[PDB]
Design a protein around this nucleic acid. Sequence first.
RNA 1: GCGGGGUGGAGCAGCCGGUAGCUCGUCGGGCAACCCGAAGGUCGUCGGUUCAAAUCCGGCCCCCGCAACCA
RNA 2: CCAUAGGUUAAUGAGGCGAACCGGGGGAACUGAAACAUCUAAGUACCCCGAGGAAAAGAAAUCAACCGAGAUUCCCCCAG
RNA 3: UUUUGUAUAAUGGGUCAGCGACUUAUAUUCUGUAGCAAGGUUAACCGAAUAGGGGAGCCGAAGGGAAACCGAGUCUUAACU
RNA 4: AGGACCGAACCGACUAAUGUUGAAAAAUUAGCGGAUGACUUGUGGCUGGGGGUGAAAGGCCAAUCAAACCGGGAGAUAGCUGGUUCUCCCCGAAAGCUAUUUAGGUAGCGCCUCGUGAAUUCAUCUCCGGGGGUAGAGCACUGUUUCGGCAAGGGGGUCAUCCCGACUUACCAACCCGAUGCAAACUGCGAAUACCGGAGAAUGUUAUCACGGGAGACACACGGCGGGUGCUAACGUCCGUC
RNA 5: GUUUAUUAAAAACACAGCACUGUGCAAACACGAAAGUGGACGUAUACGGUGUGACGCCUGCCCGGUGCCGGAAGGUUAAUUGAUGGGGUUAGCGCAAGCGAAGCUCUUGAUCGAAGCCCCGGUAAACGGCGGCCGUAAUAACGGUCCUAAGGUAGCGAAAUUCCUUGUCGGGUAAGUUCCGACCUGCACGAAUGGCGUAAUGAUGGCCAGGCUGUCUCCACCCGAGACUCAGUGAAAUUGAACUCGCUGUGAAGAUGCAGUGUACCCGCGGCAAGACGGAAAGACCCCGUGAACCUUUACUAUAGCUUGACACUGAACAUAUGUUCUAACGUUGACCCGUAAUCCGGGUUGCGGACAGUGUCUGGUGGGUAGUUUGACUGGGGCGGUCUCCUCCUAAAGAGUAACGGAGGAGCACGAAGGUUGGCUAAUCCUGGUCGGACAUCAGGAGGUUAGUGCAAUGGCAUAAGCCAGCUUGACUGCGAGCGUGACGGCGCGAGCAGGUGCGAAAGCAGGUCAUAGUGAUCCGGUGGUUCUGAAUGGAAGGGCCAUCGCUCAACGGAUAAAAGGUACUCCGGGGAUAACAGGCUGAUACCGCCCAAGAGUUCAUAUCGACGGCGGUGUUUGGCACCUCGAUGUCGGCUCAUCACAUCCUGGGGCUGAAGUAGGUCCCAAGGGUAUGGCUGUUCGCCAUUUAAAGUGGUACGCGAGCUGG
RNA 6: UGCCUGGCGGCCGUAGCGCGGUGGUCCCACCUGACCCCAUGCCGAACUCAGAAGUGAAACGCCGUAGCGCCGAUGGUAGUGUGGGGUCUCCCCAUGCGAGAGUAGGGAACUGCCAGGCA
Lengths: 102, 51, 78
Amino acid sequence: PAVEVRLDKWLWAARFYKTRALAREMIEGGKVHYNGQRSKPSKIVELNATLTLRQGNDERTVIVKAITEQRRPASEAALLYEETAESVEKREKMALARKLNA
Amino acid sequence: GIREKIKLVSSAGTGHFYTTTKNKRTKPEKLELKKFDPVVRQHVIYKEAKI
Amino acid sequence: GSTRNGRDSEAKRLGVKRFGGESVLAGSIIVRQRGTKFHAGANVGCGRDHTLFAKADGKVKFEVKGPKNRKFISIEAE
RNA sequence: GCGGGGUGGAGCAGCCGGUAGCUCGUCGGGCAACCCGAAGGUCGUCGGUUCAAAUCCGGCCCCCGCAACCA
RNA sequence: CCAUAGGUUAAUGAGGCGAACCGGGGGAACUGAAACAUCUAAGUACCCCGAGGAAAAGAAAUCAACCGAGAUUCCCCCAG
RNA sequence: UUUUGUAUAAUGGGUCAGCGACUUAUAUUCUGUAGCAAGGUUAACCGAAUAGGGGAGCCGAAGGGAAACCGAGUCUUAACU
RNA sequence: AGGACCGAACCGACUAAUGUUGAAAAAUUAGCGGAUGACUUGUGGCUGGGGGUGAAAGGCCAAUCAAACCGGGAGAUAGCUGGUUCUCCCCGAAAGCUAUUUAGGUAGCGCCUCGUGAAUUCAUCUCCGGGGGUAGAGCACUGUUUCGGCAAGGGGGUCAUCCCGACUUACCAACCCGAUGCAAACUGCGAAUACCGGAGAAUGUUAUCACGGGAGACACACGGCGGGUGCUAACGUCCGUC
RNA sequence: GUUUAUUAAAAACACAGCACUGUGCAAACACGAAAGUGGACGUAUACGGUGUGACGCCUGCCCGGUGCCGGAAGGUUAAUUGAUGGGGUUAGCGCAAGCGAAGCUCUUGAUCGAAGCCCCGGUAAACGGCGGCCGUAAUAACGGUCCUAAGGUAGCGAAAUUCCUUGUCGGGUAAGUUCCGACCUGCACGAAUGGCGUAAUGAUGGCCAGGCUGUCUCCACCCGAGACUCAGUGAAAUUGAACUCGCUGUGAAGAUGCAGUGUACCCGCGGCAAGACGGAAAGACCCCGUGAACCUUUACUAUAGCUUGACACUGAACAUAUGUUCUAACGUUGACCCGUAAUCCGGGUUGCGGACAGUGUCUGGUGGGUAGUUUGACUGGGGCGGUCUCCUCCUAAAGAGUAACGGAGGAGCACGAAGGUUGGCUAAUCCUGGUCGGACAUCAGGAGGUUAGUGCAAUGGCAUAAGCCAGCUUGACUGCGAGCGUGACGGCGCGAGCAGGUGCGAAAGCAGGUCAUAGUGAUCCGGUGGUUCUGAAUGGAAGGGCCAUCGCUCAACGGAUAAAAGGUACUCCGGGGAUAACAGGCUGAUACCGCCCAAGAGUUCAUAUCGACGGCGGUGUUUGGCACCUCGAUGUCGGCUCAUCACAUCCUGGGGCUGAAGUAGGUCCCAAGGGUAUGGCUGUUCGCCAUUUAAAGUGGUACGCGAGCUGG
RNA sequence: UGCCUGGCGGCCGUAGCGCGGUGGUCCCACCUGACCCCAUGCCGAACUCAGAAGUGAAACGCCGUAGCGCCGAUGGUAGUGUGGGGUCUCCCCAUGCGAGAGUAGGGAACUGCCAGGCA
């Protein structure tokens, strides 16, 4: 009996946003993307499924299999979201672009 | 319960067998014992086998 | 109005089946009991469930013996 | 009248015999977002079992879902 | 276009009724199972077609058991 | 009549007369009786035959075992005191 | 002109009374609505039962409709209610246990009856051989309870001053000791009865056991005694024995 | 306008208007095994289905669930096709065991395989939904926070919706549970199962006023038809038989019939209805039946219909199983000609579709559209709740057994060592001494003697240990079983001893599971291994049999089927006072009313008047208990009319005490002769309010009184 | 035959604890050594073997002593079977049985077989 997980719940567990209300607001604003397109908060996160999340100014893309309803310490959050190598490279590219802008 | 039924097959080659129980988790080792066998009439060594 | 009680076990017909002075055939159960309330004496065996059975024809006999003052059943041969 | 709950300031796993932890709230440090460290319960209250109760049982207080119906 | 369909006439037969029995085409439920669906009731009640004084079946591509019987139908046992 | 129990204010009957409810068929066990007696008895059918024929059959005389099989024994077991 | 207005015929049926074995199986009387319309009516036709029709109420379908009427399966089934008809003689219950989609039925046992067989088989009394752990009693045990003695230790804290020796309590006091109670799930004691067995005399229509034919019954009530529940309330309810 | 003909005429149905959705015509849909017919002799400005119901202002958020529409990237998946493996049989080869070609045959099922489902989007005038908790300005604007698909916008709001409730305030009235208007604390309004207004209309619901009056205080009289008398005709329901009284009691518990007692000449006629649990209808309410019907659904099992694919009707070429083209099957509800006096039908010519469509067999999906059924029992009525088998203790009354929806706890296992044997050992607790070490660690000694331990509840056991440790081992063996216990039976349990073989011990001996009592599942149907026991002509095999053994939370635990949930107020049948609701009956916990002791209040004083902490009674009067009468009928609340009784007295009457100056009171005692309101609100009894009176009594009488009235 | 000692029993607290005293010729115990038979989840403590220098210290046996344990009358009381009765939640009466606790008191065991040392 697998327990379904909400998208904003997954984000709140991943600690990307301070509160689930903020997660819902960011998703509804269209900034957050699932599979690279606008997605509603009701959407389900799945294992090996890309999460084209947009936080602050830097994008992240994770396909993690471990999904946790419970919010964890950041040391555990690093394991909670996978942050594949391509996503790491894109994130550093965005960071370099931000540094150039600054 | 957790204990699963098993058969102790005679090594005499006569096909006779005994039935007992054990739990696989704690004792993964094979079960082997000298039990009487009526058809051959002698105490022969029995090894466990699937039920 | 719910109660947690109402549960009981079927009675087990224990007690002394053959009393003193009664002629019993070999193997007749003398007392059925929980624990060795009556102990095994001459010509009496104690089964696994602590029942006592005569091992020979004769007359059953209770007595008190030993430093513990326990009851013993024995078949006076006859 | 029947069942559930009563856990740091709030929300929560746990926990369900084996020395109490996580997010937010506060402070401080790294650095709006994000990361680290710390104070923070005494487990609703009183008893019992156990070598030992957050844990297990009996009663007590409050709040929750129900039913209190046909004549 | 031959021809066919079609039309007129003529001769023969049919048509409808009848209680039961017989053959065939369809075919229930109540009920019993202490409920009920597999099943039973039951190929029964009922509907329809057809024929006769009877109908149906009938002359082994059948049984048997290494010995044999010799179409079909009906009755008594085999046998609950 | 039904009931633990009904004068009951429990049920039925206005009255009279007539009708009205454990039967019939088959098969099995037991009791009594009758025949025969390690034998008993026929059914259909033939028969004008309540006769006679018909003995095809059923029951028991021998049981044990799932069964082959064995038999006053058999089965169980390698074998039973 | 009007699904207009008032109002007779005509259609309808809102209120009241009468009637309720009626004048009438839905009417009469006085009031009431529509009355050129989605109106009303005569004559004939079509829709047929799990079907028709329904401005929709499960309404109507020949005084019958949550599935018409008639005939047939049909004597459906009915663990249910009622009834069961002449006479005498002998015997004579049960309302309990077990199991049941079982609780108001049925099956086996228990109880009744008829027949066959069988032993002093059975009952009372006397004596003898038995185990018990109930009434009672007790507090060693398990719990509970009151008072007092000493007091380990501790609580308000300290003389002492590291302490020991002890200082008073707002004082709390464990275990032990002395005295008093309480218990269905306390027992180091323990009856009367009852029950099992053995022997003996008297009495009893074999009263006892086994096999077979036939059942009925498995709704019980009150009273005495021992009890749970109840309020040591009930002509209350559930057990045991009579 | 229509409607329950015969208790419901309406707020219900319909309505014009609005919207969604289907339908390209051989339309969709419907009746129909099919041919056909309606739709329609219509053609999207038409027809069908669904929801709302003129008109005015508007119809907010949510697509997660269910439905509908659309999609292909993937997984699963039927019929069909039958690669591989295994088995059976035997011409042969071997001496025998056994091996085994071809054919035939039993079995597993590789590959192909559409829709659907899983999956992804859209749709709410589709079915639907519009939540919690905490703090914050007494409320809680506002914020935080959990969850969800997202948490009620506009409008309205104690309403046809509001339990607390007769909500709060104001008008009307002297008095207003109704009404009217505002407030918002909306238990539980809300936008086409539409929200809010609205002129007109209504045999519609609620309220107020003028006028009117016999509705009423309170009835009086009169006119007619019955009622009454005479003559003629002449019913009915009911009925065990009656020589048919009241009271108190008794009693299957509400008596004309019984006990005691009182009263009573026999019999009509006119009237009233308290009783004959009066007549009428085998209770309609409640329960029971392994009853019925009809209805609902994501109960079970089917099935019409819809829909998918394979094969057949069903063909040809060309290119790469797919596509293009073709005509010859097939369709034509296109045109024309003929039979023909004919919008049927058939034949011919032609055209258009064309191997598609359509139909048959098989097959997956969907399928309350339709059909047969199920939906347990105990139960101090039923339902809801709990329980259903097994073990331990008590109730259980000193053998066994013994019920309750009695009081208390456990079980659905564990273990190849926690079994067998041989050898060895003895605990809890406390005191003293001792490093960390302390109340409790291990060491030594002493006291004590089983208060420890038992793998798990409790009871009974346990020192010869059944408790703890070690060595060796598998008796946690195979076949039997004298006798006995316990059960209705099925079965369950104890067992010395015998044979074969084994373990431990030097031997005597012990060992057929564990200290014992719970740790469980019948039969059927199948599965696996062994055994010719049987083998439908014979030889084999298949199947069956015997032995071992596996598959049920069949837990409703003696197990109904492999497979099953609800409604009925539209109801119906057989039954019960075996069993509820009203009333009566039994009891009196609670209720009411008395009384006892006396702390205290009363400035002092316990008792003038109250009386705490406790105690003892009375009545049968409320709330309740039982289920004894009535379920082949005992009509229920309130009002009207008519009353009768008790006294625990509201007034009038007499009197004691007083914290009684008088009047006026408080309390208590005696007393039942007579008396003992009108109104508003509401169905009210009750109750609040207004105004009176000397007073506006408390109760019984089937909570008096419906064969006396009504019917809110 | 008497005393004493060891083993095996009968009986299972009148028989067991406490306190005091006494015993070494024989017996028992302690004791000496342990490489070895044998053993320590370490230890010659236990178990085991090889011995007889010392002693009766501890234990053991024996004697005495009521501070305990224990046994325990008679009488009464409680209870109760059968029958009768009352003011009936409990009693009473006739008759049969008759406790428990408590009191007076008893009590420092008795006894069988074999073996050994002394007289």
